[PDB]
Structures are given as structure tokens and as C-alpha cells.
Design a protein around this ligand. Structure first.
Ligand SMILES: *[C@@H]1O[C@H](CO)[C@@H](O[C@@H]2O[C@H](CO)[C@@H](O)[C@H](O)[C@H]2NC(C)=O)[C@H](O)[C@H]1NC(C)=O
Ligand SMILES: *[C@@H]1O[C@H](CO)[C@@H](O[C@@H]2O[C@H](CO)[C@@H](O)[C@H](O)[C@H]2NC(C)=O)[C@H](O)[C@H]1NC(C)=O
Ligand SMILES: *[C@@H]1O[C@H](CO)[C@@H](O)[C@H](O)[C@H]1NC(C)=O
Ligand SMILES: *[C@@H]1O[C@H](CO)[C@@H](O)[C@H](O)[C@H]1NC(C)=O
Lengths: 63, 49, 14
């Protein structure tokens, strides 16, 4: 429900998946908590979409 | 559009870029998207007057 | 060939 924005680049997608990439060259990254910043929420941003932001720490805590 | 081939960008994202370019985080625009558009529209009307 | 340190490792162990 929190709104994640790119730290840099743009959130883009193909027919099934969202990636974040630098504006001048397509090089899609997995959208993770290390790629986004959070500010405000989904009740405010117009055009916001529903997806999962990956947290690399979770599996490290479990492994 | 003037860099070579033109690339389509939703207008509000062009603004997010422009705002980031002057030191303000690209979240300001969305929190204030309507405010910004309204101030803009007002300013243009003022110029014509 | 060299190494890169990951600060998380010792935190997981501590
Ligand atoms: C959108 O891009 C993703 C990333 O390349 C494509 O999904 C991958 O497909 C391969 C082959 O089946 C899998 O091994 C990968 O694990 C998939 N990646 C992810 C993130 O799931 C996806 O097919 C592309 N979608 C469209 C509609 O073209
Ligand atoms: C930032 O300043 C603007 C401009 O004065 C404020 O927007 C106005 O707020 C009044 C109510 O106090 C409304 O009657 C006007 O119609 C608003 N103007 C426009 C163009 O919408 C805005 O609220 C201020 N924001 C903060 C956080 O202080
Ligand atoms: C994009 O435009 C369509 C068609 O006018 C509209 O239905 C949709 O809500 C718009 N989305 C955003 C984020 O502005
Ligand atoms: C995400 O899904 C929830 C339901 O689980 C819905 O209430 C919410 O409006 C959706 N948000 C977006 C941005 O699509």
C-alpha cells in the first residue's frame, strides 16, 4: 500500500512483468527495495500500479 | 525529441524528470500534481492578460 | 580478481 518510486530511471513493463531501467538505455533491472524509495502511498499517486517489490534480505534471514 | 529520434514520454513523467533535475525528489510532483497543474494554468492566463 | 565485502554476513551470524 506504500508507494515505491524509482531512485533513478523509470518503471516499465512488457505484457507480464515490470522492471526498472535507466532512461537513456534499456537495461531492465529487477525492482527491489535497493532500487526504489518510498514516499506517501497508493491513495495519492495517480497511475500507480499493483506489483511486488523484492527484498534481498528476506532469504538471507532465512538461509 | 531534439537529441536524435524522438521518444514518447507521458507528460507528468517529463515533469518528474524536470523536477528531479532541480533538486526535488520525484514524489513532489505526484503529491502536488493537481496543484502544480493549476498553478501552471493560472500563470499562463496571467501572461496573456 | 579480488574480493568484495558484504556487511550483512556478520550480522546474520551475530
Ligand atoms: C517479460 O520479460 C521477462 C524477463 O525476461 C520474461 O519472463 C522470463 O521467461 C523465461 C523463459 O520462460 C523464464 O526462465 C524467466 O524466469 C522469466 N522471468 C521472470 C521475471 O519471470 C517474460 O516472458 C516477458 N513477457 C512478455 C509478455 O514478453
Ligand atoms: C502551497 O501554496 C499553494 C498556493 O497558495 C496552496 O494552494 C492554495 O490553497 C488555498 C487554501 O489555503 C486554496 O483556496 C487555493 O485554491 C489553492 N491554490 C491552488 C492553485 O490550488 C497550497 O495549499 C500550499 N501547500 C502547502 C503544503 O502549504
Ligand atoms: C490514461 O488515459 C485513459 C484514457 O483517457 C484513462 O482512462 C486513464 O485513467 C489514464 N491514466 C492515467 C494514469 O492518467
Ligand atoms: C491493489 O489490490 C487491492 C486489493 O487487494 C486494491 O484494493 C487496490 O486498489 C489495488 N491497487 C492498485 C494500485 O491497483
Amino acid at each position: 500500500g506504500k508507494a515505491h518510486f524509482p531512485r533513478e530511471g523509470v518503471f516499465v513493463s512488457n505484457g507480464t512483468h515490470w522492471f526498472v531501467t535507466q532512461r537513456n538505455f534499456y537495461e531492465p533491472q529487477i525492482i527491489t527495495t535497493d532500487n526504489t524509495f518510498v514516499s506517501g502511498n497508493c491513495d495519492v499517486v495517480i497511475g500507480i500500479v499493483n506489483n511486488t517489490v523484492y527484498d534481498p534480505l528476506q532469504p538471507e534471514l532465512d538461509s | 525529441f531534439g537529441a536524435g529520434p524522438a521518444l514518447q514520454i507521458p507528460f507528468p513523467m517529463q515533469m518528474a524528470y524536470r523536477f528531479n533535475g532541480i533538486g526535488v525528489t520525484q514524489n513532489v510532483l505526484y503529491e502536488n500534481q493537481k496543484l502544480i497543474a493549476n498553478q501552471f494554468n493560472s500563470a499562463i492566463g496571467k501572461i496573456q492578460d
